[PDB]
Design a protein around this nucleic acid. Structure first.
Lengths: 66, 66
DNA sequence: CGTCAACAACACA
DNA sequence: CGTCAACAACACA
């Protein structure tokens, strides 16, 4: 996402407010302290790790139990 | 442990009967089917693995939960 | 390359 | 080599 007000004033981090249905178009940026800045226009993954971690747990746990 | 009767007849595997207090001296060998053969004279470890396995479980589990 | 033996996991009681 | 920043774990509510 992008806007001119983001480069034109003081900001490093920003909180993004959105509607899941509208993520493809318009979001609204807020400062870390809650002040509205402007809106910005738009110009299984980690579960594999979770599962692999689960197996590497269970096998090691049974092996430690015996 | 050792005995002459062990090399002098048919055996591959043997069940050892013992008294924890007498392990340093005399044990009694039995066949896999329970027949007494003779006695034999005597001529933290895995917990480190268990603990390491425990840590590698817990860290991965919290990481999968978040 | 083929077969066998053991270890590990899953299912069952 | 020194300092800083972030991530992860443990303890607390």
């Amino acid at each position: 996402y992008y806007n001119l007000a983001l480069m034109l004033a003081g900001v490093k981090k920003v909180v993004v407010r959105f509607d899941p249905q509208q993520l493809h178009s318009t979001v609204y940026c807020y400062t870390l302290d809650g002040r509205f800045i402007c809106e910005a226009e738009c110009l299984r993954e980690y579960r594999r790790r979770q599962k692999q971690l689960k197996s590497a747990t269970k096998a090691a746990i049974k092996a430690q139990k015996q």
